[PDB]
Structures are given as C-alpha cells and as structure tokens.
C-alpha cells in the first residue's frame, strides 16, 4: 500500500507546484480530497488537534510520511 | 457488502463537509452519482415517493441505513 502511497506524495505536490496559490490554507485542504479511506479519518483529526488554523504544508505530509513506517526485506 | 457500505457513508459526508453548499438540493442528488447498482434504483424511487422536492439530507442516508440490516455472528 505505502509504496504506492510514497508515489502518491510525489505528483500531488508536483501538480500544485506549477499552479499558483493565493494563500496556504486551501493548499493543505486540497490534499484530503484525494486521500484514502482510513487516512482521511486521521487527516480529519490532525487539523482539529492543531489549535492554530494551519501548521505549514510539509508538516501535513510528514505526518502522512510518519504514517508510512514501511521497510522491505531485500 | 454492507460493511463496506457502512464505510461508504462516512467519507462522502466527510467530503462534502469541508466544502460549502449554496443550498440543500444539489447535496442530496450528489450521492446517487456514486451509489451502487440496485441501490440507485431504490434511490430513484425514493425521491419520487417524496411529494415535496426534498426531505433533508440525513433522511436519505437513514433509508440507506435502513437498507443495511446486517448484524454479524461473533
């Protein structure tokens, strides 16, 4: 799953890369529109645990990167 | 089937949650665009049985929740 989800990080950053942004808030809420079924539950809780309106865009990805935890064998 | 369909309730409410709505009518007709093959037949009949244009958004879900009827054994 996560090996696909590692790639799933890559293009969605690359998609919003070439397009502009008027601010930072709508960028971080754009991701959850594409996210998976149990991950969006974590994604919903993660904004509510943030007391401020936004912790910056990479930090949302790193918690999803910390959601990965997957090494292979060989 | 329905154990998946219980989850299928959850995100589609959560998807439209963070997005706005100008009214209530287009929200209830958005669901049937994703619904299953025999369920959309029930979904088509359910609006026609409503004499008024809309009975509110949860009531459509509860009839789908009443469509479930599935307990497990252990």
Residue numbers in the entry:
A (entry chain A), B (entry chain B): 37 to 110
From the paper:
Adjacent CA-NTD domains exist in different orientations; therefore, we considered a pair of CA-NTDs [one in orientation A (cyan) and one in orientation B (dark blue)] to be the repeating unit, and aligned and averaged the four independent copies of this pair of CA-NTDs (excluding the CA-NTDs from the fivefold position). In this way, we generated a higher resolution 5.5-Å map of the CA-NTDs. We flexibly fit the homology model of the Ty3 CA-NTD into the new EM map. The N-terminal 36 amino acids of the CA-NTD do not have a defined secondary structure in the homology model; however, in our map, we resolve density corresponding to this region. This density runs outwards along the interface between helix 1 and helix 2 of the CA-NTD in the middle of the threefold (and fivefold) position for ∼60 Å (cyan and blue densities). In orientation B, this density continues over the top of the CA-NTD and down the interface of helix 3 of one CA-NTD and helix 1 of the neighboring CA-NTD on the outer side of the threefold position (blue density). Instead, the surface of CA-NTD helix 3, where it would otherwise be bound, is occluded by binding the neighboring CA-NTD.
In the case of Ty3, Gag3 is cleaved into CA and NC domains. Formation of the capsid is important for genome protection and is an essential step in the retroelement life cycle. Similar to retroviruses, the protruding capsomers of the Ty3 capsid are formed by the CA-NTD, while the inner layer, linking the capsomers together, is formed by the CA-CTD.
